[PDB]
Design an enzyme around this catalytic site. Sequence first.
Site, short mmCIF file in Angstrom:
data_model
loop_
_atom_site.label_atom_id
_atom_site.label_comp_id
_atom_site.label_asym_id
_atom_site.label_seq_id
_atom_site.Cartn_x
_atom_site.Cartn_y
_atom_site.Cartn_z
N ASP A 30 0.86 -1.16 0.00
CA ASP A 30 0.00 0.00 0.00
C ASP A 30 0.92 1.23 0.00
O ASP A 30 2.10 1.12 0.35
CB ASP A 30 -0.88 -0.05 1.25
CG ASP A 30 -1.73 1.20 1.44
OD1 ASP A 30 -2.47 1.59 0.50
OD2 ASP A 30 -1.66 1.78 2.54
N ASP A 75 -2.14 -0.52 5.92
CA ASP A 75 -2.60 0.14 7.15
C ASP A 75 -4.10 0.42 7.15
O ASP A 75 -4.65 0.88 8.15
CB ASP A 75 -1.84 1.46 7.34
CG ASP A 75 -2.27 2.52 6.35
OD1 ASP A 75 -2.53 2.18 5.18
OD2 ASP A 75 -2.38 3.69 6.73
MG LIG Z 1 -2.92 3.07 3.49
#
Ligand SMILES: [Mg+2]
Lengths: 992, 39, 268
Positions: A345, A686
Amino acid sequence: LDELKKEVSMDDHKLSLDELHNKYGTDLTRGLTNARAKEILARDGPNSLTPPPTTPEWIKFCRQLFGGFSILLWIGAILCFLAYGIQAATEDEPANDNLYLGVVLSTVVIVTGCFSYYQEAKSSRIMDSFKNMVPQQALVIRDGEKSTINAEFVVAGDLVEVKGGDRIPADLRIISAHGCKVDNSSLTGESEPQTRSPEFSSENPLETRNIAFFSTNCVEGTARGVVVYTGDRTVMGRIATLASGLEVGRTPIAIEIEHFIHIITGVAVFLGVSFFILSLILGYSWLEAVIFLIGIIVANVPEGLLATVTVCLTLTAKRMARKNCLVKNLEAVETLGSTSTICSDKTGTLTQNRMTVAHMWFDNQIHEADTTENQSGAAFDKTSATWSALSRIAALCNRAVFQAGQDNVPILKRSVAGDASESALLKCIELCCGSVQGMRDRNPKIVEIPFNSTNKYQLSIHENEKSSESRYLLVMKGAPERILDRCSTILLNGAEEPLKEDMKEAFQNAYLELGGLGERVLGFCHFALPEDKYNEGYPFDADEPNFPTTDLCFVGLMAMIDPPRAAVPDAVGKCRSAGIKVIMVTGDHPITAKAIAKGVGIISEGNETIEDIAARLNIPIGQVNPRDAKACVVHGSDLKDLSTEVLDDILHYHTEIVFARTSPQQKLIIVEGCQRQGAIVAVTGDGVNDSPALKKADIGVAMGISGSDVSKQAADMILLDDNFASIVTGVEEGRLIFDNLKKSIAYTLTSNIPEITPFLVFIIGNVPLPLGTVTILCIDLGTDMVPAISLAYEQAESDIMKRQPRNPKTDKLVNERLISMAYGQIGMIQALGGFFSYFVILAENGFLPMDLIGKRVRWDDRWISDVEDSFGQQWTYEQRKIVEFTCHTSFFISIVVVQWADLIICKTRRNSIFQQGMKNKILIFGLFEETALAAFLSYCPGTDVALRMYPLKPSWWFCAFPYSLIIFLYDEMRRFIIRRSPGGWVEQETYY
Amino acid sequence: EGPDNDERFTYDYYRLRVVGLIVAAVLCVIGIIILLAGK
Amino acid sequence: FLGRTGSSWFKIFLFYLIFYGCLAGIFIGTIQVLLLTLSDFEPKYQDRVAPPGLSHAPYAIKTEISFSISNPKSYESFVKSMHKLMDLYNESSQAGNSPFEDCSDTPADYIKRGDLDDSQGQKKACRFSRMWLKNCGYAEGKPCVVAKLNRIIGFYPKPLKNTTDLPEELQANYNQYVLPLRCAAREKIGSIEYFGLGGYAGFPLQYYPYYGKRLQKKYLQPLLAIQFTNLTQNMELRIECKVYGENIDYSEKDRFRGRFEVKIEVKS
Ligand SMILES: [Mg+2]
Ligand SMILES: *[C@@H]1O[C@H](CO)[C@@H](O[C@@H]2O[C@H](CO)[C@@H](O)[C@H](O)[C@H]2NC(C)=O)[C@H](O)[C@H]1NC(C)=O
Ligand SMILES: CC(C)CCC[C@@H](C)[C@H]1CC[C@H]2[C@@H]3CC=C4C[C@@H](O)CC[C@]4(C)[C@H]3CC[C@]12C
Ligand SMILES: *[C@@H]1O[C@H](CO)[C@@H](O)[C@H](O)[C@H]1NC(C)=O
Ligand SMILES: [K+]
Ligand SMILES: [K+]
Ligand SMILES: [Rb+]
């Protein structure tokens, strides 16, 4: 089952408001009827998520109790009770042998079960985190009246109302809205507020404004909407099911364990029954034929090995806990070392997740600011009087403020009330000009025009802090081109000057470069209003232009972006030097995704996409050979219409890959694609939009501070300080533990031979039993334990980060080279050293080696209390047995003595001990404690009854010393050959 | 000695055990010292 | 094939052949040096045979000799072993002044034939007539068990002195030259009768010390015949024969350490 959920969703945002009501039998104004809502409740079911069916811990524990070694140990334990039963019936045996040994072995299975159970842990509460995102209550309009209801009682069709601060209770079709902004980070990973309005604004429902989604929250304003989906049927409720439903699967390390279990189990059943028949042919009673078999079992199975592995893993996880890297699953300690591909990510993972000023354009010059958290860069400018003019506008023409009580935390980390761009500017000036609040106190704001959708600028009028003036200063910021159309002069190095086409072109150049860097660019300008035309009491009208907004002085440009974390660029390069492929997978827009890719080193300098080639050469993209492009940037909207085979070609044909504007299922698909090619893949993320990918990854790593609860539930590992450098450490630790396990396994296996061979010679030679069954367990469960563990603390023999990732198909944890060395070479030398001490004990008590052949018959005969030795003396039954058990004791101690050398040689696979040294303090501890244990077991009074261990005479300890030394020399000579010729012979034969 | 050679069929297993246990203990202490050089 | 090519299969054979060959040659070498450190006449250690064991001829199934008087093949098992032992004490086996000697027909003192050296021929052993074993096919009813003291090189069995009290209090106490053997069971339902050298219920000290198989082959150890003409029948009788001496001790574990454990039962 979940293949349906891996697909992009279909919606009804294209329908009119009225049309949408027909589909759900609903009223736009009055809402549903109390009766119709309850009807739909029973029809569709609750607005809730149901957790997937789990496997109870019962079945999880017992599934380990039947894995190769435990199976063989069970056969041994029962075969003990078998021989015991046959005894209790035939000749009354007042002994406890088979009974107790059967109890001991069954305990070994149970305790070993706990170790493997502890290792195969699966702490997963994915669906629980998702359930936490549904509010307890919702506001609905029923029978023309608004009431709060249990959110689970919400159904498709009713009229729902939301306002700033509340969670979207279900997927809604927006029918009415007033200044409504929403946080769609759940679906994109981006937290910038997105407007919601009744108007359809994109064919793609995940991008349109007239849809609001469950799992997100309203950030400001108010909106009303019609529920289109409920519970499991919502967009993110399906993501929930997908994520929670995904089959876990076996780890690389787990697969390796099972593999050597098959090998060792194989040789065990081979020699087991190979000598069971070999005994019957020799005319051994089934009464004995089983007793020998039990011994064979105990000899072949390394009873303490699986538990060693677990402890070595645990100890490696403890070291990583001490670097802010939490491991939820013990096996994930190794996966990172076997990782060949990282899918990462961007936002909150590679990046800090905070709009930060990156560059400034003033004095006809591009300046770069420091974007790093801890500010590890340098200054750009302080001297130029222009800077102070730009700095003043950035502070003054800004409505952002720091939250109360932050003075303790660093500037860049503190929470700010305001939009991202104003916060960035606030933190920029606060950093390099001190307290911004001070600047806003010295220059009191009298009138302002806040940023308008139509104006595309924000202006402010302040009382100049200067005492000699104390007059009125005008400042404004906005779109770079709009600010330009309102300027006549430029503050160059202090003094103003006319805005000639020259500087105007340099502006465009600066503007295009900063924008090319994927940065958001703003224009800044000011104007010192004429004193005579503006008195100290002159009133300014903000509603109607009461003051000039043209012919102003352009001061400069400022650019900003959500920047990489300081450690990220270097960590990416380090992963790539270790031969790990790094792919970006983000919900963010392509221009931003690509720019950070270059910033962190995902896309290296000079590498092009097909689009880059086409623009450079000024030719059609179809005219470009796609093989000329090693880099690619794939938008999610195109990904959607590609088959997996075509996705596989993208993965194969590019070294530098960026997947942008991906949905959560699309991240899963990319991960699966990589895995399909046979690669071990790590995911770093996250957000909740990383949950499926994190689950499917061989190892998922979540960010600890910035990470959402869902992401950390889906992960195997948490970076508690958001230190991306930990990935590099993790892969290094992972590789080191893999090698050290080999060392520890070889060490443990080596001592199997000196435990097997005595039982074989017992049959083929008809001599007294050299070593007992109990004695074997004193080794594998006792003495070898701490030494075997200590190998986990071995340093690397070379630069492990310099080698490519292991091939999980070829590079095994236990191969033929290990068995050849442990079983064929070193273990064989240990066996002899054992036998030697055995012959020494017997010969010094009167039974010379020659007379021992074919004596077991009379030796074991309990009724012959007068066996003649070589010297013509006569021994009772218990007398000769004491010597025999003393033989078991010295044979045992011989193993310990030869394991001294083995421990030192297993220290290194290639290097010499004279190179690697003896700096492992745990290993040295092992040597001392091992010897202490052995001595205690021999000399402690009463141990002759409980374990049949007898005191050894001092000279006995030294029997195996010459064999212990030969081992050290032999292995040192052998490894000297390895190093001296990387060719292959010694290497391809014995190099673990 | 002659008829008084009883010592020929005797061994001090008691002292050997005392010494053996002393050694085992001291090796155990030494090990702790080296391990505890950093924990 | 399975693993490798033929060329590789050969090389792995040439290696392990030379390798295991060397290991065997080294193992043998260490056995050589071990033997080189040992005497031919006396073992390095003797503390594990130290207190002499007492063993008998009747091969006990489990420290027991049960049979039926009214049955022939009921005791023919115990007569096999009984014969095996006594067949060695034949007079035809003890012929000429070599290597046997006529010793006192009455219990006498020790005899030292020098040291454990080969500086002399085969050390001459005392003769022993099985004819000293009065009354004892063997006892078809009420067995005639034969006792024996385990041989230990250089061992001088020393009888107890009549300083204080004794089990067989002072009766026929040949204090200076006899190692006594008194069998027992309370439970006194028997009739102990002992036969031996000089008519004594012990071992004549003139048969000691034993010089070992290498320095004394054909050597004969003294026997002590014991007959239980018990007037009882059809019950397990736990009879323990105990030897007494300064160098004689016992153990709760080793039930043969200077004593017997016989479970006679004339179930007829
Ligand atoms: Mg992220
Ligand atoms: C040792 O003495 C026994 C005494 O019984 C000998 O047994 C003799 O066996 C022969 C042939 O089987 C019989 O004819 C005799 O009746 C037995 N007794 C005697 C006194 O001669 C036995 O043969 C002898 N063993 C050796 C090896 O000489
Ligand atoms: C007690 C004694 C008689 C048993 C001796 C067993 C010997 C013959 C065994 C023990 C270990 C064995 C070796 C272990 C490892 C390998 C490597 C593999 O790629 C081919 C077989 C090979 C080369 C085995 C051949 C046979 C071997 C050398
Ligand atoms: C033993 O045999 C003798 C003859 O040699 C005989 O006189 C005597 O009665 C027997 N003794 C017993 C107790 O039966
Ligand atoms: K995972
Ligand atoms: K072992
Ligand atoms: Rb074992």
